[PDB]
Amino acid sequence: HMTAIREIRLSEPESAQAALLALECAQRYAEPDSADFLADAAVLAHDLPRAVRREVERARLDDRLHALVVRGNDVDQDALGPTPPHWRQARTAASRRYGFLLVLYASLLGDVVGWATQQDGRVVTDVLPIEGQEDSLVSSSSSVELGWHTEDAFSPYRADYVGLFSLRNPDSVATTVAGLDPDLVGPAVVDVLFGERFHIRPDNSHLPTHNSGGRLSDYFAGIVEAVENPRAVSILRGHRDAPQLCVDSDFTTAVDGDAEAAGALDTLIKHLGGALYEVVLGPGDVAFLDNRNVVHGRRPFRARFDGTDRWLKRINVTADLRKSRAARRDAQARVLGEA
Amino acid sequence: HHHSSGLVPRGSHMTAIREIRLSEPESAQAALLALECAQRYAEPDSADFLADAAVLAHDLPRAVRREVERARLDDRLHALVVRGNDVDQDALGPTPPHWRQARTAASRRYGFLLVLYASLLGDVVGWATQQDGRVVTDVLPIEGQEDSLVSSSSSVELGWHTEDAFSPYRADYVGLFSLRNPDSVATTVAGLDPDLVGPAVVDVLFGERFHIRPDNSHSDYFAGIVEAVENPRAVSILRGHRDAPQLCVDSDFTTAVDGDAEAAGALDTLIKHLGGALYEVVLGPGDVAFLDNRNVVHGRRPFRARFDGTDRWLKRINVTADLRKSRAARRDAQARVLGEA
């Protein structure tokens, strides 16, 4: 589909209008995931520029979308200061405005959520290279490619959209994206991928090693259960003309003894691995990946660890907050796995 | 004629009814937006309008949008009620004798306004088997269906249910826009208060121990509808968090699984509880309600239809929080009619 990537470039006035709204939110509320802000966010998002809201709404109802990309938001690089050396230190005063703006864009597409087992249950999370994580399989990697995956592929509560706000990307490091064309794998493999014949385990970002050590063991009980005893699940679901995709290149296996399923997974990985294409998010570019339609990753790069490194804000968006209520502490709570 | 909003409790449900009263300026703003939409778009459920509806809805009065957004995230809501929209009774003309004659030029502006309010809560959908797959449907009494089990009834109690209880694609909200209601006829509403029911009965209702069949009201889709009557799936009546369970039950079309006497018991306990807990919502002309179909059953009590063009008349809509999830049951990405293909 020619419109699989939908791009809006902000005019200077539209950029200024989005920046002023984000700064008004920063003046009113403490954190971009403060409960009072999140309660108000869907209505505050309505004050974003009309031309932007029109294009976001076209993207939201496009069931073949790969990504909506909003180019040219204002980022004051001098005021932002250095790229933090760890996500734990990335909730900086100077970066609050970008957190608020990411939530406002996201709230046009649905309701923002976080995970108890990712970056200590923060709703606005940070993607930046960490010294000693170069060769890890998590978003803080650099030297090793971030393997392509559906975000939280293991979970029935996985996001409908993943939002990425690029604060800085001096070496133009590419995000990687792929969808599945059913006609190009054959109806034989599509039939197999629709079967509950696969195990999808949680990725390494959900491990205690990528959260603060003081976090309750019991936050991880659900993750540990999903690693040890994965449910038999499909990779494709929904309409044959527009199937949803759910797979993680590093954490998906066929069920033991299902040679036909193992073959279809092998075929899918080769198809997606090759079709995987690049989107570069420059400073002030915001992307929303349709997590029902595409896998994503990130190209390998060399981090300088001098405060100049690539830095994205990330958010998960659900079309239907109500459906995850069994996994949330209370009605307004946005952190999946607190129940 | 000032703006006001508040929480109206029913039993232990402290936010059961979220009520909004429009100011005269808010009513005029909403009316002007609906009239502008009626000038620029073919139909309140045409593809051109529905592609834009969620953005146009952002032009409704801000104070109303804040209160609607609070209702949308209230997982214990029964009914959001917005009172005081403009209805020009003289210009509207008589209540049509049948829904087939009810998509009138004079009533278009009210269909547009219902869709604008609905689009603050989610995406509007219809059903291939209901009023020719119209998204904006019509509720009015039909002569010769006084004693019918459907929304065109009058003399007989419309028996209460979750809307489309049998279906995994059932609406999150049912919307009603009252055009006229001279005898103050009510919608009946009930939710479960788990503090009034034995915990053991609640545990049974969470079990996949029930059959919910379609009404006779209701092809890969229609193959599923025949199977739904003949070989119904074992489903639960309650689902989700114990602190905020969703309800799905039909007083006339729900049974326990063959041989499950305990489930038969729990079901009849629930039917007696909801029957006893029914309360009424009356919508005057220009009053709009959204029932949270995840939380409440609804019905209607007997009333006296004259069939002289003065009868009660509402516009009705179904809203889903997640349009994408029903794509297997819709014709194409933008089509809103469940079971169309």
XYZ file of C-alpha atoms in Angstrom:
680
model
C 0.000 0.000 0.000
C 1.433 3.428 -1.121
C 0.021 5.008 2.140
C 1.560 2.351 4.507
C 3.891 5.203 5.703
C 1.761 8.378 6.262
C 3.945 11.520 6.687
C 2.865 15.017 7.924
C 5.581 17.733 7.910
C 4.609 20.487 10.390
C 4.664 24.094 9.120
C 6.547 26.500 11.494
C 3.178 27.725 12.954
C 1.907 24.101 13.507
C 5.295 23.199 15.139
C 5.026 26.342 17.360
C 1.342 25.534 18.259
C 2.240 21.911 19.299
C 5.274 23.218 21.308
C 3.106 25.888 23.110
C 0.467 23.246 24.049
C 3.222 20.893 25.374
C 4.763 23.771 27.418
C 1.256 24.660 28.816
C 0.960 20.980 29.969
C 4.514 21.117 31.485
C 3.514 24.302 33.418
C 0.284 22.663 34.759
C 1.402 19.048 35.555
C 4.471 17.389 37.201
C 5.153 14.361 34.918
C 4.014 13.495 31.365
C 2.417 10.368 32.963
C 0.955 12.165 36.043
C -2.575 10.717 36.642
C -4.274 14.195 36.426
C -2.551 14.884 33.036
C -3.470 11.405 31.644
C -7.151 11.935 32.703
C -7.143 15.280 30.713
C -4.801 14.171 27.817
C -7.470 12.986 25.288
C -9.232 16.435 25.471
C -5.926 18.440 25.595
C -4.811 16.484 22.442
C -7.855 18.098 20.615
C -5.956 21.479 20.843
C -3.165 20.169 18.512
C -3.216 21.721 14.993
C -6.356 20.729 12.983
C -4.399 19.622 9.830
C -2.327 17.284 12.098
C -5.486 15.872 13.845
C -7.042 15.203 10.367
C -3.985 13.201 9.164
C -3.681 11.311 12.521
C -7.393 10.285 12.216
C -6.784 9.018 8.600
C -3.844 6.918 9.966
C -5.924 5.605 12.949
C -8.643 4.077 10.675
C -6.145 2.752 8.031
C -5.976 -0.984 8.876
C -2.979 -1.378 6.463
C -0.936 1.436 8.182
C 2.750 0.653 8.919
C 3.558 4.042 10.518
C 2.332 7.619 10.865
C 5.356 9.993 10.926
C 4.953 13.618 12.148
C 8.100 15.549 11.073
C 9.492 18.855 12.352
C 8.460 19.324 16.015
C 10.547 21.996 17.853
C 13.453 20.472 19.886
C 15.768 23.013 21.646
C 19.032 20.926 21.643
C 20.951 23.452 23.873
C 18.134 23.538 26.520
C 17.737 19.681 26.363
C 21.355 19.201 27.574
C 23.297 15.901 27.394
C 21.803 12.471 26.573
C 21.515 10.659 29.941
C 23.792 7.593 30.361
C 20.830 5.376 31.562
C 16.985 5.363 31.208
C 16.796 5.560 35.067
C 18.341 9.112 34.810
C 16.370 10.084 31.634
C 13.324 11.709 33.410
C 15.125 15.104 33.103
C 13.485 18.521 33.732
C 14.544 19.688 30.207
C 12.962 16.607 28.449
C 9.514 16.862 30.214
C 8.044 18.994 27.342
C 8.869 16.170 24.822
C 7.223 13.562 27.102
C 4.072 15.759 27.313
C 4.026 16.296 23.506
C 4.470 12.526 22.817
C 1.469 11.772 25.123
C -0.683 14.492 23.389
C 0.010 12.987 19.882
C -0.499 9.439 21.281
C -3.874 10.405 22.867
C -5.292 11.114 19.356
C -4.792 7.332 18.616
C -5.968 5.818 21.938
C -5.043 5.623 25.642
C -1.390 5.406 26.779
C -0.228 2.393 28.857
C 3.024 1.139 30.399
C 4.231 -2.222 31.775
C 5.089 -3.035 35.452
C 8.139 -4.958 34.066
C 9.519 -2.279 31.644
C 11.553 0.718 32.983
C 9.868 0.468 36.450
C 6.295 0.943 35.072
C 7.003 4.352 33.460
C 4.404 5.198 30.760
C 6.863 7.543 28.922
C 10.042 5.409 28.536
C 13.499 6.209 27.114
C 15.427 4.664 24.202
C 19.142 5.575 24.486
C 22.387 3.569 24.285
C 23.757 2.281 27.642
C 27.481 1.507 28.171
C 27.679 -2.300 28.759
C 24.379 -2.972 26.840
C 26.012 -2.554 23.340
C 25.453 -6.274 22.458
C 22.161 -6.782 24.432
C 18.796 -7.599 22.714
C 17.034 -4.526 24.294
C 16.336 -0.960 23.003
C 19.450 0.362 24.932
C 21.708 -1.658 22.515
C 23.959 0.012 19.882
C 26.636 -2.310 18.325
C 24.100 -5.212 17.865
C 20.922 -4.591 15.739
C 17.645 -4.466 17.734
C 16.016 -7.639 16.341
C 12.627 -7.007 14.682
C 9.482 -7.775 16.737
C 5.887 -6.893 17.504
C 6.098 -4.799 20.745
C 5.224 -7.119 23.707
C 4.357 -9.917 21.199
C 3.923 -12.418 24.122
C 1.001 -10.436 25.677
C -2.734 -10.294 24.832
C -2.493 -6.668 26.166
C 0.264 -5.654 23.656
C -0.112 -2.072 22.333
C -2.030 -1.143 19.145
C 0.577 1.633 18.518
C 4.183 2.224 19.592
C 5.084 5.949 19.623
C 8.727 7.081 19.182
C 9.679 10.786 19.658
C 13.259 11.369 18.397
C 14.951 14.062 20.583
C 18.283 13.569 18.763
C 19.781 11.188 16.192
C 23.044 12.809 14.988
C 24.164 9.747 12.876
C 20.673 9.240 11.268
C 20.300 5.723 12.795
C 17.319 3.955 11.124
C 14.290 2.367 12.806
C 13.433 -0.855 10.871
C 9.837 -1.783 9.895
C 8.151 -4.732 8.088
C 4.554 -5.825 7.400
C 3.348 -9.175 5.963
C 1.913 -9.375 2.394
C -0.255 -12.562 2.593
C -0.057 -12.984 -1.266
C 3.830 -13.144 -1.087
C 4.113 -16.003 1.511
C 1.273 -18.043 -0.159
C -2.147 -19.063 1.305
C -0.453 -22.353 2.501
C 1.905 -20.545 4.996
C -0.881 -17.971 5.897
C -3.213 -20.910 6.897
C -0.424 -22.325 9.182
C 0.428 -18.870 10.715
C -3.350 -18.443 11.591
C -3.156 -21.643 13.722
C -2.427 -21.568 17.496
C 0.862 -23.429 16.786
C 3.549 -21.036 18.202
C 5.198 -19.969 21.501
C 5.949 -16.213 21.878
C 8.042 -15.490 25.021
C 8.603 -12.065 26.663
C 11.684 -10.218 25.316
C 14.642 -9.364 27.611
C 13.364 -5.777 28.387
C 10.778 -7.423 30.777
C 13.569 -9.119 32.861
C 14.568 -7.842 36.344
C 18.023 -6.960 34.807
C 16.344 -4.056 32.826
C 14.404 -2.679 35.873
C 15.502 -1.197 39.265
C 16.687 -3.923 41.734
C 14.216 -2.703 44.420
C 11.190 -3.723 42.225
C 8.889 -6.422 43.759
C 9.628 -10.027 42.544
C 5.809 -10.423 42.083
C 5.750 -7.790 39.247
C 7.768 -10.419 37.276
C 5.581 -13.523 38.154
C 3.515 -13.022 34.944
C 6.704 -12.544 32.842
C 8.409 -15.638 34.385
C 5.206 -17.724 33.749
C 5.156 -16.489 30.076
C 8.876 -17.554 29.645
C 8.444 -20.984 31.334
C 4.921 -22.020 30.108
C 4.080 -20.007 26.950
C 0.481 -20.450 25.646
C 0.014 -21.926 22.116
C -0.818 -18.782 20.004
C -1.245 -17.737 16.334
C 1.081 -15.285 14.493
C -1.747 -14.080 12.143
C -5.358 -13.243 13.178
C -8.463 -11.380 11.902
C -9.603 -10.941 8.248
C -7.653 -12.896 5.535
C -7.578 -9.622 3.416
C -6.040 -7.623 6.374
C -4.561 -10.035 8.966
C -2.854 -8.735 12.125
C 0.764 -9.832 12.748
C 2.241 -10.920 16.121
C 5.836 -12.271 16.123
C 9.257 -11.681 17.752
C 12.273 -12.774 15.588
C 14.321 -13.682 18.747
C 11.551 -15.082 21.076
C 9.148 -17.072 18.788
C 9.285 -20.894 18.244
C 6.844 -23.443 16.710
C 5.214 -25.792 19.317
C 7.358 -28.983 19.797
C 6.717 -31.608 17.038
C 4.871 -29.184 14.648
C 7.418 -29.408 11.751
C 4.812 -27.722 9.431
C 4.559 -24.720 11.866
C 8.407 -24.574 12.325
C 8.713 -24.404 8.470
C 6.107 -21.574 8.157
C 7.943 -19.578 10.937
C 11.287 -20.124 9.041
C 9.604 -18.812 5.799
C 8.061 -15.792 7.654
C 11.428 -14.808 9.296
C 13.189 -14.956 5.847
C 10.345 -12.881 4.200
C 10.215 -10.235 7.006
C 14.059 -10.124 7.427
C 14.427 -9.223 3.694
C 11.433 -6.799 3.374
C 12.594 -4.984 6.603
C 12.918 -1.285 5.532
C 14.355 1.865 7.122
C 12.675 4.976 8.607
C 15.093 7.595 10.061
C 13.532 9.679 12.876
C 15.393 13.023 13.024
C 15.196 15.360 16.067
C 11.527 16.429 16.455
C 10.170 13.499 14.358
C 7.400 11.407 16.073
C 6.402 7.993 14.617
C 3.441 5.760 15.586
C 4.006 2.157 14.387
C 0.773 0.145 13.937
C 1.801 -2.755 16.217
C -1.061 -4.892 14.787
C 0.498 -4.656 11.276
C 4.310 -4.299 11.577
C 7.364 -5.650 13.377
C 10.077 -3.053 14.136
C 13.748 -2.932 15.134
C 16.755 -0.598 14.895
C 19.968 -0.712 12.818
C 23.331 -1.223 14.550
C 25.274 2.002 15.380
C 28.396 3.122 17.329
C 27.454 5.068 20.516
C 29.969 7.799 21.623
C 28.806 7.795 25.339
C 29.780 11.531 25.572
C 26.226 12.977 26.038
C 25.600 13.464 22.257
C 24.030 10.011 21.616
C 20.684 9.139 19.980
C 17.712 9.595 22.368
C 14.036 8.675 21.735
C 11.005 8.903 24.082
C 8.708 5.833 23.675
C 5.035 5.198 24.544
C 2.544 2.315 24.146
C -1.013 3.160 22.980
C -4.121 0.928 23.277
C -7.326 1.414 21.216
C -9.215 -0.112 24.206
C -7.979 0.610 27.773
C -11.073 -1.133 29.270
C -10.011 -4.563 27.858
C -6.863 -4.684 30.096
C -8.716 -3.800 33.371
C -7.925 -7.321 34.823
C -4.160 -6.422 34.493
C -4.423 -2.835 35.952
C -4.536 -1.770 39.654
C -7.694 0.407 39.241
C -9.787 2.105 36.497
C -7.384 5.035 35.740
C -4.082 3.138 36.379
C -2.158 2.699 33.081
C 0.509 0.135 34.174
C -0.149 -3.423 32.833
C 0.834 -6.152 35.372
C 0.100 -4.159 38.602
C -2.862 -6.667 38.909
C -30.093 27.712 31.355
C -26.474 27.435 32.750
C -23.995 24.509 32.230
C -23.976 21.891 35.051
C -22.822 18.267 35.476
C -22.915 15.726 38.295
C -22.955 12.113 39.457
C -26.403 10.547 40.103
C -26.080 7.299 42.124
C -28.270 4.138 41.788
C -27.977 1.702 44.754
C -24.218 1.236 45.533
C -23.244 2.502 41.998
C -21.993 6.010 42.996
C -21.255 7.077 39.347
C -24.132 5.040 37.767
C -25.449 8.135 35.887
C -23.126 10.932 34.709
C -25.467 13.835 33.856
C -24.488 16.929 31.788
C -26.886 19.889 31.279
C -25.917 22.047 28.252
C -26.065 25.854 28.585
C -28.069 27.662 25.828
C -24.726 28.636 24.142
C -23.447 24.991 24.309
C -26.771 23.698 22.838
C -26.505 26.298 19.978
C -22.780 25.423 19.345
C -23.632 21.667 19.054
C -26.670 22.447 16.800
C -24.561 24.726 14.495
C -21.829 22.006 14.180
C -24.489 19.324 13.306
C -26.181 21.703 10.766
C -22.743 22.464 9.166
C -22.040 18.667 8.899
C -25.532 18.131 7.298
C -24.590 20.805 4.640
C -21.112 19.292 3.829
C -21.677 15.472 4.062
C -24.189 13.117 2.353
C -25.340 11.113 5.443
C -24.666 10.814 9.190
C -23.122 7.359 8.406
C -21.644 7.944 4.899
C -17.912 7.064 4.482
C -16.999 10.789 3.868
C -18.536 11.854 7.229
C -17.338 8.858 9.305
C -13.702 9.376 8.123
C -13.932 12.931 9.654
C -16.422 12.343 12.545
C -13.831 11.845 15.363
C -12.059 15.182 14.444
C -15.341 17.142 13.929
C -16.481 15.824 17.388
C -13.513 17.867 18.895
C -15.473 21.058 17.891
C -18.255 20.188 20.419
C -18.228 22.436 23.544
C -15.009 21.906 25.604
C -16.818 21.639 29.023
C -19.029 18.846 27.564
C -15.955 17.076 25.995
C -14.160 17.065 29.428
C -17.239 15.454 31.113
C -17.720 12.912 28.244
C -14.010 11.925 28.507
C -14.448 11.320 32.309
C -17.464 9.060 31.504
C -15.482 7.181 28.770
C -12.795 6.064 31.307
C -15.297 5.356 34.164
C -15.399 1.510 34.146
C -18.385 1.559 36.615
C -20.540 3.902 34.406
C -24.161 2.839 33.674
C -25.330 5.828 31.554
C -23.854 9.126 30.343
C -26.798 11.540 29.843
C -26.387 14.872 27.971
C -29.572 16.965 28.392
C -30.688 20.134 26.590
C -29.836 19.801 22.858
C -31.957 21.912 20.442
C -34.842 20.028 18.700
C -37.103 22.153 16.441
C -40.368 20.148 16.864
C -42.290 22.115 14.138
C -39.494 21.562 11.516
C -38.981 17.851 12.494
C -42.596 17.004 11.484
C -44.499 13.830 12.472
C -42.993 10.603 13.919
C -42.711 8.170 10.966
C -44.872 4.995 10.977
C -41.867 2.648 10.351
C -38.045 2.845 10.571
C -38.033 2.224 6.744
C -39.600 5.761 6.440
C -37.586 7.378 9.297
C -34.331 8.520 7.573
C -36.021 11.886 6.808
C -34.388 15.122 5.521
C -35.814 17.034 8.566
C -34.259 14.552 11.091
C -30.755 14.396 9.416
C -29.273 17.082 11.745
C -30.092 14.834 14.811
C -28.388 11.783 13.209
C -25.267 13.946 12.582
C -25.294 15.260 16.209
C -25.741 11.714 17.655
C -22.689 10.525 15.599
C -20.643 13.600 16.759
C -21.369 12.828 20.478
C -20.819 9.058 19.864
C -17.417 9.734 18.209
C -16.088 11.189 21.545
C -16.543 7.624 23.004
C -15.342 5.459 20.067
C -16.240 4.406 16.519
C -19.861 3.972 15.339
C -20.962 0.542 13.968
C -24.162 -1.108 12.723
C -25.394 -4.668 12.077
C -26.271 -6.198 8.666
C -29.448 -7.831 10.151
C -30.758 -4.609 11.881
C -32.592 -1.811 9.935
C -30.790 -2.667 6.622
C -27.303 -2.166 8.219
C -27.932 1.536 9.067
C -25.459 2.878 11.675
C -27.956 5.626 12.741
C -31.146 3.605 13.447
C -34.665 4.700 14.495
C -36.626 3.713 17.642
C -40.375 4.312 17.190
C -43.536 2.242 17.710
C -44.833 0.295 14.648
C -48.619 -0.451 14.324
C -49.047 -4.287 14.183
C -45.887 -4.888 16.318
C -47.390 -3.569 19.662
C -46.734 -7.121 21.086
C -43.233 -7.639 19.511
C -39.894 -8.501 21.283
C -38.090 -5.666 19.311
C -37.615 -1.836 19.760
C -40.785 -1.082 17.631
C -42.940 -2.572 20.496
C -45.216 -0.442 22.787
C -47.912 -2.443 24.748
C -45.392 -5.205 25.796
C -42.180 -4.961 27.942
C -39.043 -5.125 25.722
C -37.247 -7.853 27.788
C -33.846 -6.659 29.087
C -30.420 -7.732 27.739
C -26.859 -6.737 26.955
C -27.084 -5.381 23.346
C -26.051 -8.220 20.923
C -25.073 -10.366 23.981
C -24.296 -13.447 21.780
C -21.630 -11.554 19.718
C -17.887 -11.015 20.408
C -18.375 -7.758 18.382
C -21.192 -6.401 20.656
C -21.074 -2.599 21.199
C -19.260 -0.904 24.114
C -21.964 1.824 24.143
C -25.565 2.114 22.972
C -26.461 5.747 22.147
C -29.988 7.228 22.117
C -30.967 10.747 20.918
C -34.557 11.567 21.957
C -36.389 13.638 19.273
C -39.733 13.517 21.107
C -41.120 11.661 24.107
C -44.402 13.369 25.103
C -45.421 10.645 27.664
C -41.927 10.415 29.302
C -41.377 6.708 28.337
C -38.242 5.164 29.912
C -35.359 2.881 28.957
C -34.856 0.317 31.775
C -31.245 -0.187 32.982
C -29.578 -2.585 35.494
C -26.006 -3.382 36.553
C -24.699 -6.129 38.861
C -23.911 -5.098 42.464
C -21.545 -7.976 43.475
C -22.066 -7.031 47.206
C -25.770 -8.122 46.848
C -24.907 -11.588 45.342
C -23.321 -14.668 46.999
C -19.572 -14.774 46.112
C -20.124 -18.472 45.085
C -22.753 -17.378 42.477
C -20.328 -14.633 41.237
C -17.552 -17.331 40.864
C -19.967 -19.503 38.759
C -20.907 -16.520 36.486
C -17.140 -16.003 35.682
C -17.031 -19.653 34.411
C -17.508 -20.485 30.686
C -20.692 -22.425 31.652
C -23.391 -20.571 29.613
C -24.864 -20.361 26.096
C -25.903 -16.893 24.822
C -27.872 -17.341 21.547
C -28.806 -14.602 19.049
C -32.366 -13.214 18.806
C -34.124 -14.433 15.559
C -33.257 -10.794 14.532
C -29.716 -12.055 13.588
C -21.205 -16.627 4.174
C -18.386 -17.153 6.790
C -20.093 -14.620 9.186
C -23.719 -15.970 8.848
C -22.281 -19.563 9.048
C -21.218 -18.432 12.585
C -24.828 -17.175 13.315
C -26.386 -20.621 12.449
C -23.625 -22.329 14.578
C -24.343 -19.742 17.389
C -27.998 -21.030 17.592
C -27.313 -24.789 16.948
C -23.802 -25.335 18.539
C -23.362 -22.283 20.857
C -19.857 -21.723 22.373
C -19.531 -22.078 26.189
C -19.120 -18.423 27.404
C -18.942 -16.576 30.763
C -21.509 -13.970 31.901
C -18.888 -11.980 33.949
C -15.335 -11.240 32.719
C -12.354 -9.064 33.723
C -11.237 -7.674 37.104
C -13.236 -8.858 40.182
C -13.397 -5.145 41.297
C -14.970 -4.072 37.912
C -16.376 -7.108 36.047
C -18.090 -6.725 32.660
C -21.623 -8.146 32.307
C -22.986 -9.993 29.240
C -26.444 -11.633 29.585
C -29.803 -11.823 27.723
C -32.862 -12.553 29.978
C -34.618 -14.423 27.050
C -31.654 -16.111 25.204
C -29.143 -17.271 27.911
C -29.029 -20.854 29.308
C -26.531 -22.889 31.385
C -24.471 -25.563 29.492
C -26.257 -28.991 29.238
C -26.233 -30.765 32.663
C -24.684 -27.809 34.607
C -27.487 -27.390 37.248
C -25.211 -25.153 39.424
C -24.743 -22.737 36.459
C -28.552 -22.875 35.808
C -28.954 -21.804 39.495
C -26.382 -18.943 39.253
C -27.997 -17.641 36.009
C -31.527 -17.604 37.554
C -30.071 -15.868 40.704
C -28.540 -13.182 38.402
C -31.812 -12.790 36.354
C -33.816 -12.293 39.620
C -31.119 -9.800 40.899
C -31.024 -7.696 37.670
C -34.854 -7.854 37.373
C -35.080 -6.434 40.939
C -32.376 -3.772 40.303
C -33.903 -2.295 37.062
C -34.258 1.510 37.153
C -35.393 3.945 34.442
C -33.782 6.691 32.315
C -36.252 9.076 30.595
C -34.892 11.195 27.713
C -36.863 14.358 26.938
C -36.552 15.942 23.463
C -32.863 16.812 22.874
C -31.582 14.464 25.649
C -28.848 11.959 24.578
C -27.821 8.853 26.586
C -24.895 6.440 26.145
C -25.366 3.155 28.029
C -22.127 1.320 28.883
C -23.075 -2.059 27.307
C -20.098 -3.671 29.168
C -21.778 -2.839 32.533
C -25.596 -2.705 32.079
C -28.534 -4.560 30.529
C -31.392 -2.430 29.152
C -35.025 -2.840 28.150
C -38.300 -0.894 27.940
C -41.617 -1.134 29.849
C -45.093 -1.082 28.264
C -46.286 2.291 26.873
C -49.329 3.573 24.915
C -48.585 4.328 21.200
C -51.280 6.337 19.255
C -49.704 5.959 15.731
C -50.843 9.531 14.790
C -47.331 11.045 14.189
C -46.904 12.265 17.849
C -45.297 9.014 19.187
C -41.909 8.704 20.960
C -38.992 8.765 18.450
C -35.253 8.254 19.155
C -32.181 8.013 16.937
C -30.014 5.049 18.066
C -26.332 4.134 17.506
C -23.797 1.461 18.551
C -20.236 2.521 19.522
C -17.110 0.320 19.785
C -13.906 1.311 21.647
C -11.954 -0.893 19.123
C -13.205 -0.846 15.482
C -10.098 -2.785 14.298
C -11.009 -5.919 16.349
C -14.185 -6.548 14.186
C -12.369 -6.315 10.786
C -13.066 -10.083 10.107
C -16.841 -9.231 10.245
C -16.720 -6.009 8.099
C -16.676 -5.555 4.268
C -13.508 -3.388 4.192
C -11.364 -1.163 6.481
C -13.849 1.777 6.580
C -17.179 -0.171 6.395
C -19.038 -0.039 9.757
C -21.660 -2.836 9.202
C -21.014 -6.034 11.235
C -21.814 -9.204 9.207
C -21.771 -7.326 5.825
C -18.655 -9.478 5.008
